[PDB]
Design an enzyme around this catalytic site. Sequence first.
Site, PDB file in Angstrom:
ATOM      1  N   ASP A  54      -6.199   8.367  -0.768  1.00  0.00           N
ATOM      2  CA  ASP A  54      -5.736   7.345   0.177  1.00  0.00           C
ATOM      3  C   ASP A  54      -4.551   7.932   0.938  1.00  0.00           C
ATOM      4  OD1 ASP A  54      -6.176   4.461  -2.053  1.00  0.00           O
ATOM      5  OD2 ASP A  54      -7.613   5.607  -0.858  1.00  0.00           O
ATOM      6  N   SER A  92     -11.588  10.775  -4.307  1.00  0.00           N
ATOM      7  CA  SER A  92     -11.153  10.548  -2.938  1.00  0.00           C
ATOM      8  C   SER A  92      -9.640  10.342  -2.945  1.00  0.00           C
ATOM      9  CB  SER A  92     -11.850   9.318  -2.350  1.00  0.00           C
ATOM     10  OG  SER A  92     -11.514   8.143  -3.066  1.00  0.00           O
ATOM     11  N   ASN A 104      -7.632   8.763  -5.952  1.00  0.00           N
ATOM     12  CA  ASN A 104      -8.473   7.745  -6.574  1.00  0.00           C
ATOM     13  C   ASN A 104      -9.278   8.361  -7.713  1.00  0.00           C
ATOM     14  OD1 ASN A 104      -7.799   5.659  -4.607  1.00  0.00           O
ATOM     15  ND2 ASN A 104      -9.096   6.795  -3.172  1.00  0.00           N
ATOM     16  N   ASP A 138     -12.448   8.389  -8.245  1.00  0.00           N
ATOM     17  CA  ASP A 138     -13.664   9.071  -7.808  1.00  0.00           C
ATOM     18  C   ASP A 138     -13.424  10.409  -7.118  1.00  0.00           C
ATOM     19  OD1 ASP A 138     -14.441   7.290  -4.669  1.00  0.00           O
ATOM     20  OD2 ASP A 138     -12.650   8.350  -5.361  1.00  0.00           O
ATOM     21  N   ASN A 168      -8.773   5.483   2.883  1.00  0.00           N
ATOM     22  CA  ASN A 168      -9.520   6.378   1.997  1.00  0.00           C
ATOM     23  C   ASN A 168     -10.397   7.442   2.651  1.00  0.00           C
ATOM     24  OD1 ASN A 168     -11.490   7.321  -0.049  1.00  0.00           O
ATOM     25  ND2 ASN A 168     -10.552   5.741  -1.336  1.00  0.00           N
ATOM     26  N   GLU A 203       0.825  -1.200   0.000  1.00  0.00           N
ATOM     27  CA  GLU A 203       0.000   0.000   0.000  1.00  0.00           C
ATOM     28  C   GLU A 203       0.865   1.259   0.000  1.00  0.00           C
ATOM     29  OE1 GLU A 203      -2.988   0.250  -0.554  1.00  0.00           O
ATOM     30  OE2 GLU A 203      -4.062  -1.519   0.169  1.00  0.00           O
TER      31      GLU A 203
END
Length: 129
Positions: free
Chosen positions: A52, A50, A46, A48, A59, A35
């Site tokens: 991380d 959003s 991301n 959309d 998120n 990650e």
Amino acid sequence: KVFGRCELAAAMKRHGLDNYRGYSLGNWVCAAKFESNFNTQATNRNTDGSTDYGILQINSRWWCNDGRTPGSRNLCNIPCSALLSSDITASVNCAKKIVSDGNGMNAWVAWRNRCKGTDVQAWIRGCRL
Ligand SMILES: [Cl-]
Ligand SMILES: [Cl-]
Ligand code: NA
Ligand SMILES: [Xe]
Ligand SMILES: [Xe]
Ligand SMILES: [Xe]
């Protein structure tokens, strides 16, 4: 802060992640590796809108507030910036809530695709814990 493999394993264990919700320490270290490569300052945008954040790439759509993710929630009740701290407390506490959401560690797509079912024990081998 970029943690060493065993250094992170020790920090996660001290924070109670070893076997939390049945997930051995190696699972958490493996997830963090893919990650964030153990970097607390890791961030990723991301599709959309959003973002991380942190060593476990939590998120903003559901878990933290960054003020720029329309219609999102802040279930961990923390600013997303807290997930970038050298102190992993916020990331660990939020991760505990996420893994308890119902789908276990499958919440982390990288864990499902790269750690799930593998010999995750290898991620903590040689570490004094
Ligand atoms: Cl927002
Ligand atoms: Cl589970
Ligand atoms: Na949010
Ligand atoms: Xe980002
Ligand atoms: Xe973490
Ligand atoms: Xe430890």
